[PDB]
């Protein structure tokens, strides 16, 4: 059968057999330099895999597929505020793309049983106060569907 | 100039067409369409037409 | 301060952001051998209407994809009744090595200057099931 699916522009019906692999991408306008961009992706937990193990597997995937992937920090993260906020984990990490070092924050949360929601910020240069505030303002304003 | 941070032609029909063929023809696309690697999906897409 | 909705919830974004999200739906475990659906976005150039935009997209695909062929172009509708969106759809093929894919793509002006594109892809010529999926998918869209 067909189930509802919601996007910014409206809703439609999707056969329940389809897995959602949508990647949201938000391009922001720069000032003097190129601006960080934002991204939301999805994943499925393996059987008996908890979030820390999932994050480990993702770090390994980044190392296998990218150049010079380097974890700079790993810590708890929170999506939203109040009773419905999601508790998860985040990293900050760099990698090399051609001649340039790319900076990313990536946070994972179990939104529903077995389902991971990932929030990513990507910058072509080191984080600054503006980029950090964007990250925390974005995560804090997420309102999970109840 | 980098499509990860700027508007580009990787949009609309073009990206829709690339995504479909990639799912079928490129095993690596399963990794760039989920989890942490999906953060760089547009970089992967650009490489498929360069 | 601008709200944004996804399946899992909603949030706020900077005021001037451009949405380049790609919705992607696959039949997991049969991804290489089953139909897939995806939805993408684009922005019209100044003074560019939808027919000219699709003209431009067709040329981009011929330039960037392998042996891209447009087999048909015809009116399309996203949704039903009063709120439906008008647009155009194409049927096409292209290749990546020795793998041929078949695609239907439809584009619509969702809001002023903003294009919404629906793409169905199959590794095989479209059978009756795939045509039914295409038409039920577009007909069920409800603009916000």
Numbering used by the authors:
A (entry chain E): 1 to 146
B (entry chain J): 8 to 57
C (entry chain I): 2 to 145
Verbatim from the authors:
One such pathway is the type VI secretion system (T6SS), which in many bacterial species functions to deliver antibacterial effector proteins from the cytoplasm directly into an adjacent bacterial cell via a one-step secretion event. Crystal structures of Eag chaperones in complex with the TMDs of cognate class I and class II effectors reveal the conformation of effector TMDs prior to their secretion and insertion into target cell membranes. Given that the Eag chaperone dimer creates a hydrophobic environment with complementary knob-hole interactions for its cognate effector TM helices, and interacts with TM helices via side chain to main chain hydrogen bonds, we conclude that Eag chaperones provide an environment that mimics transmembrane helical packing to stabilize prePAAR effector TMDs in the cytoplasm prior to effector export from the cell.
However, the EagR1 homologue SciW from Salmonella Typhimurium crystallized in isolation and in the presence of the N-terminus of the class I prePAAR effector Rhs1 (Rhs1NT), allowing us to determine apo and effector-bound structures to resolutions of 1.75 Å and 1.90 Å, respectively. Interestingly, despite the abovementioned similarities between the SciW and EagT6 structures, the conformation of the N-terminal fragment of their bound prePAAR effector differs significantly. In the SciW complex, Rhs1NT adopts an asymmetric binding mode whereby the effector fragment does not make equivalent molecular contacts with both chains of the two-fold symmetrical chaperone dimer. The first TM helix (residues 19–33) binds to the hydrophobic cavity of one SciW protomer whereas the remaining hydrophobic region of Rhs1, which consists of two anti-parallel alpha-helices connected by a short 310 helix, occupies the remainder of the binding surface. Phenylalanine residues F20 and F43 likely play an important role in the asymmetric binding of Rhs1 to SciW because their hydrophobic side chains insert into equivalent hydrophobic pockets found in each SciW protomer. Our structural analyses suggest that Rhs1 residues F20 and F43 play a critical role in its asymmetric binding mode because the aromatic side chains of these amino acids insert into hydrophobic pockets present in SciW that are lacking in EagT6.
